[PDB]
Design a binder for these strands. Structure first.
Ligand SMILES: [Ba+2]
Ligand SMILES: [Ba+2]
Ligand SMILES: [Ba+2]
Length: 327
DNA sequence: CATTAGA
DNA sequence: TCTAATG
């Protein structure tokens, strides 16, 4: 967590590069398990040779560690940080809709900048287009104060369309977080569960609602069970318009909510942790259900949930308010 | 790890 | 169809 820091940090630094600037999925995969193990190790790596003893740790990386240990840096590292192509690859990527594949492609053509991008709006798809459009706002954080605002509206229209709707705003927000990145809306309906062969429209209904009133301002991608978008709080009595914000709406079988709800709310560790525990408690938790464990090794058969509670009761734990689901 | 776009 | 991009 800190005694093996630089290494893991230097390491990840290294792995990301392979993945991104290069297409070295394996090298990449390499640097990572390394950065992984050297991270778990209970002692200050004093030398490469030391480290090397490790699993994942080969002569290539060990070599890296002494060089880092020795001098407070790394050339490969200094070199890459300096390299313009590589710089450009890291940069275009932040564009929503821009992946590494695309990143290199653009660069190859010579589209290294923000402006490059505008000048060639044509070479961009709709997604990438919007991405480009709202580059600033997309990067910008979302004050909780806003999340309240957003969540308000969202709930109203959901209700307006059908009162049988169930929408919850999942994420760190859900968890009290003073600020969020985008808004996560897990949606459901009685009329939509495990078997009941869809009702795509169910999704379709609300999107349209959010639109009609001007909440949704763009579509990144809309499917029959998972919409991806852009929104904007109505800009007041002028002088202060609100930044475009990424939203995300997903349909859900009413018979899979709470798990997913439980799940999407995190935290990553809370999650994992509760999960660890259901295992002992003779269960299995996953984004969709909760099954009872069968000694033979495994078992199936999803227990019935009607609330975040049920899941709790099941693994006989203390109900934890989303607030304190931090870990 | 699953959904969407797209070409 | 595949393959990239989000989460
Ligand atoms: Ba080894
Ligand atoms: Ba991106
Ligand atoms: Ba998200």
């Amino acid at each position: 967590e800190t005694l093996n820091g630089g290494i893991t940090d230097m390491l990840t630094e290294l792995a990301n590069f392979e993945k991104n600037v290069s297409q070295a999925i394996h090298k990449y995969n390499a640097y990572r398990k390394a950065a992984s193990v050297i991270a778990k190790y209970p002692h200050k790596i004093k030398s490469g040779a030391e480290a090397k003893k490790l699993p994942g740790v080969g002569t290539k990386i060990a070599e890296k560690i002494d060089e880092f240990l020795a001098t407070g840096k790394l050339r490969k590292l200094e070199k890459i940080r300096q390299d313009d192509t590589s710089s450009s690859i890291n940069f275009l990527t932040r564009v929503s809709g821009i992946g590494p594949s695309a990143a290199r492609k653009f660069v190859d053509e010579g589209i290294k900048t923000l402006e490059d991008l505008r000048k060639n709006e044509d070479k961009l798809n709709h997604h990438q287009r919007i991405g480009l459009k709202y580059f600033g706002d997309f990067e910008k954080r979302i004050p909780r104060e806003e999340m309240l605002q957003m969540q308000d509206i969202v709930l109203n229209e959901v209700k307006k369309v059908d009162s049988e709707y169930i929408a919850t705003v999942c994420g760190s927000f859900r968890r009290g977080a003073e600020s969020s990145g985008d808004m996560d809306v897990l949606l459901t309906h009685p009329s939509f569960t495990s078997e009941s062969t869809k009702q795509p429209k169910l999704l379709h209904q609300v999107v349209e609602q959010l639109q009609k009133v001007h909440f949704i301002t763009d579509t990144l991608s809309k499917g029959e069970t998972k919409f991806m978008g852009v929104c904007q709080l109505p800009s007041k009595n002028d002088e202060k318009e609100y930044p475009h914000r990424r939203i995300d709406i997903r349909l859900i079988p009413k018979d899979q909510y709470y798990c997913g709800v439980l799940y999407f709310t995190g935290s990553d560790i809370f999650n994992k942790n509760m999960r660890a525990h259901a295992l002992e408690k003779g269960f299995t938790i996953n984004e969709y259900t909760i099954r009872p464990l069968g000694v033979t090794g495994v078992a199936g058969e999803p227990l019935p949930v009607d609330s975040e509670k049920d899941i709790f009761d099941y693994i006989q734990w203390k109900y934890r308010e989303p607030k304190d689901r931090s870990e």
